[PDB]
């Protein structure tokens, strides 16, 4: 039928099959002008309906709109005038074919729809959609063909049709211009994000993120300038969506579980599929489309080889094939990037929807299930389980995209070689089994590695925190070896694990060559008729390279799904747990009473004995009643039942109004004191001040360093029981509720503060004089000022009555009211916390193992190592003692590192390793040239002319070259492993000796947290991931370099393209790293908050639920999640930006190569066009891998830099010098000071000045003074802890300066101010140096009155001790340090005021012991008990750093003076 419509033939061989070939103006003016129209017509109504339903306000008109409308109008008028001219040309006696009638009319019809659809878009967000943007591309691609034919026809010399050509040419141009104009964003400039408003091209090449790329390059970027996340992902939206389906599923699962077996089994997985099936479908379609291109390239490569093999062909074939290869690569990359983006976005959505839902359940779960779990366990649950589920949802489509890819690949190989292909596959299948046996061994080793690493850190924390005591007694040398033993014991396991990992990389590295040698040898040797040729060989190599990945990622995917199974099972127990029952507390306005108990009976457990039994009482409003009883009576249980935290058994409770809670164990949040007192309330001034003053929290607040705005909590000043109780009471009284349930709020405070609080806050005349008060107490001091008292016994009420009535009853109250009341004095003080902010990770900026397939082994290990390391830190309980707020306040008053690391490794081995890797690359190029020659050999011979000698020679050499390649790699890997284990040893050892020898200034300025982190995190980083990246980068670089030598060697001209693309590569490279690095940090800083908040709320749930303050905390958690969800996307998109740019560069560098071998084909063979393209086909992704891998080693080298800084910290005076003292130097206790002047730090002034005193032998001296007089400095001046800015100290005629450092301390003894006990055994604390024998030790405890405890202990001197002697009680901790100093029996003893916490009897013993034992010695004591200072031969007085009075105490008191005035103030005599 088409023959009469048109006039020419549709298709004839003569049209083609010629040097010059072209489709006729019949095929081009038919199907090529029907496809574009069909797309627009068929698909128009769907887009019209999609706009119709969602029509909103019109947007302001912009210049682009009018340009796009006027160009279409020009097209319309052009088509109209063409139709008019055609109709006017021939009317009479001219059967003009309808191709000149329909085609003109068709276009005129379409342009109208284009005008309409464009206007409709003006009413939507994205103006330039995908519909028109794809239509224009289709039209241009279809119309390019008419162009060539038309031009040629005219150029050839025919002038018959010139209007049509000119008309068509004008339209084709205007189409180009319209397509160009249809790419501009034309933004409304919405500050949220430009993702919603972006044309098709911008949203497909990611050329809208680049703004941030320009912003972060100039100046560092903060959280302000990162675009917000879209509404579809906001936490509030995701939760509701997931909650609907969760609620709908669980109930059905519960019903199914109840119907049978008469705890759900599988509901979470379904709830997720039913919620997010649509994204799954879209991603599946995109992955299916991409999977096709993976096998398209090899066919074009075979066509190129065939075309270049012969000579009598046409150029058009080669040019068309090159263009097709370019287009296929571009399309495949564009589809793959979009699929990656969709999948990763879905993963993030799932992770947020699980984390927020877990948080929301945590604060509504029953008490039984909550008490079953642990505080840290639930935090680890959210921090680990949710992350595991994110990974298994980032790489699930692989499962189906493998069993298909593999199958397809196998099919092709068979259609290319024959039954021989099976031989290669089998060798490529046997590898996986072997890989497993080695992974299990690696895990087995790593477990013990982790165990030994844990203990070392436990000794490190103690020594770093208590560095003062070590210096005083000179115990530094022992701990050196004590920790080096553990270091070596760990190093051997590290070396074993390292050499095992090398075997695995070797098998995954040589498998390509092995499969090639086996397949080719079997194919050529199995039958004499078989003859190799270039196309078959090179295509087989390409398909092997394609297939090598899935068979090596499928094992990993199966292992991951196995972990996600148990992770899912654990979460479903928590998210599916029961809820607490509330059908026992009736919140009605009884009014008649604010409380009523109708024979209630509640139990803590499910069905155990009732803790509270048969309770019935009622108290009117405005009544203060006190609940008293013995220990374990059940008061707090009664108040918890009032709150409703127990399970009802029998009865009901009526409550009118709100409630307030003051728990026995005070709970404090993180933040300022003002934030804690407010607890989410509008700030006032007439009530805030009243609350603070009434709770007597004013004097203390004045003494805090920051006043009211002082950070309190885990990461700040740790207050004592006395204060934390007053803060809790102040918060409760400021919130101003109706019913107050106080549980012992006056226990930690003393008598004065307690009386003041009772008379000013809660009592007959106080702040809460109208509200009802229920207080539980243990002291009978405030009983007469109450209204009604109740005595609880065995959980039930024994007697209820007024104070006078109970006293008149004459029974239990008489005995009860004796001296039960217990008073508490000031309790300890504050405790500052050393900053330990460390959260650097290893697995970052990497989302799946599909983006960087070459390095899947290392990526998997890093994830597992990070997950394992998370638990340890959570379950660690670091015990670095603590510091007193008082003492802390006084204290306040470039490529070179790469060279350093290489020098630590050893340049001698580095040279040989580089030589080995380079030699391997040469053997690679050599093998390819042997095959290229072997394949070339075929053309000379034929089927029945191949000799046997050639057949054997062409394969023996191939085998030899493969063997050489394998050997050189193995050697390179074998040495690399050792070259590192040595580095970790020298770096740590060198660092430890230097850091352990630093002066006190450095230890005082830098917080302990920073110093200990270097010994733990960095050492782990510099001995684990570092080597993997350092060994992968060189392999990638050498592969790229080898590929380029091959292409340039074949055709020299290519050298030109190398320079330009490099300038682009190194440019595109700096940009990415200059931004990604900053986003990596932001992510870590904005994560820890979330887990901190969850831990806080879980610990303080009853207080949260007593005040009815749950919505605020839910909102806080939602904001904290939306801050991190905004930052993750900002790097998930950046990685996709780089890919489109580098995959484009990599595809361009192969397109040119192909064309350069079609213009110079004359001097080229088929095989030479094989080794050049077969390799260059896999250079696109290798660039992306190199940039990503070089963006990780650059981020990881930061470890070595830190370690180096502390290895070069200033040191103090040498331990031992040549100047030795006379034997038994401290013969007599003769000390003298000559104008001794000193300063703590060079920037600080002299603290002690003009000191001139004399110390006699066998003399007892008492140093006493005022605050800030430098009393304690005197001691820290005799142990040469500081220097000597002025003057000197002479003992036994020998200046302390001349004598060596470790030569002086040994012969001096000092009792520590705060007795500290190290871990280990009792022998280690008493004598780490094992110099003494047990016999003389056994005498020491006899003198110390401690032999009774130690003899009857579990062991003798071998008994272990926990942290800071936690197993031992306080009484012996101070006592033991007395015995420690007793063993040394030195000559000069410097005592200090350290008997403050020693009990009277013990104190007395300590005091007399000093006198009985130390008699033939000199004793200098700095003390505050002026009374105790009475027997000193000479009393020295310091004012502000100057000696004042030096005389006997009797003389000092006989003659009035500053000492006598102090004694008069003290009143000792
Ligand atoms: N959280 C709990 N879980 C289980 N049983 C508990 C719990 N708290 C208390 N009990 C049980 O109830 C008994 C009474 O505890 P409760 O704290 O009510 O007594 P109390 O007299 O108020 O104590 P105290 O005088 O020390 O404040 C305990 O000895 C124990 O047997
Ligand atoms: N670590 C330090 N860093 C800086 N200056 C310090 C440090 N320790 C002490 N000082 C300075 O030295 C002064 C004297 O401190 P020292 O403890 O010797 O005085 P003191 O009169 O014995 O104290 P107290 O009355 O509390 O027993 C401090 O007030 C302070 O100015
Ligand atoms: C598949 C397309 C899109 C790209 C691949 C190149 C195409 C255009 C080339 C590759 C091989 C070519 C064929 C090779 C040999 C012959 C036999 C001849 O007597 C008629 C033409 C015909 C059948 C050619 C037609 C064009 C052809 C199919
Ligand atoms: C708009 C662009 C993408 C169209 C691409 C095809 C163009 C560039 C091609 C198609 C047909 C080609 C022409 C075909 C034949 C000849 C005759 C020859 O003796 C000189 C080159 C010349 C004149 C070619 C020039 C380039 C040409 C016009
Ligand atoms: C399909 C899209 C993407 C690109 C289309 C490119 C087409 C139009 C190009 C690519 C290679 C070109 C051919 C290359 C060489 C010659 C030989 C010359 O003596 C006549 C023109 C002729 C025969 C060209 C015709 C046009 C041609 C076939
Ligand atoms: C993007 C696509 C559509 C256009 C670019 C295709 C390029 C590679 C094509 C288009 C026109 C082609 C040229 C057209 C005409 C001739 C003359 C002929 O005697 C030798 C080949 C030569 C010199 C062609 C080489 C290849 C060529 C330059
Ligand atoms: C097996 C191992 C020990 C071989 C050692 C390879 C050495 C020579 C290689 C591996 C990693 C390389 C570094 C990788 C990254 C960069 C960042 C770039 O901006 C400058 C070069 C620099 C700094 C490289 C210098 C050379 C380097 C240190
Ligand atoms: Mg209690």
Residue numbers in the entry: 1 to 262, 305 to 935, 963 to 1538
Which text from the study accompanies this structure?
MRP2 is a single polypeptide comprising of an N-terminal transmembrane domain (TMD0) and the canonical transporter core of two transmembrane domains (TMD1 and TMD2) and two nucleotide-binding domains (NBD1 and NBD2). Using cryogenic electron microscopy (cryo-EM), we determine the structures of human MRP2 in three conformational states: an autoinhibited state, a substrate-bound pre-translocation state, and an ATP-bound post-translocation state.
Residues 894–897 form a sharp turn at the top of the TM cavity, and residues 898–918 form an α-helix between the two TM bundles. Near the apex of the TM cavity, the loop-turn-helix motif of the R domain engages in hydrogen bonding and extensive van der Waals interactions with TMD1 and TMD2. In addition, the C-proximal region of the R domain forms a composite ATP-binding site in conjunction with the Walker A/B motifs of NBD2. By sequestering the ATP-binding site in NBD2, the R domain of MRP2 competes directly with the signature sequence of NBD1, adding a new layer of control. At physiological ATP concentrations, ATP is likely bound at the interface of NBD2 and the R domain, further stabilizing the R domain in the auto-inhibitory position.
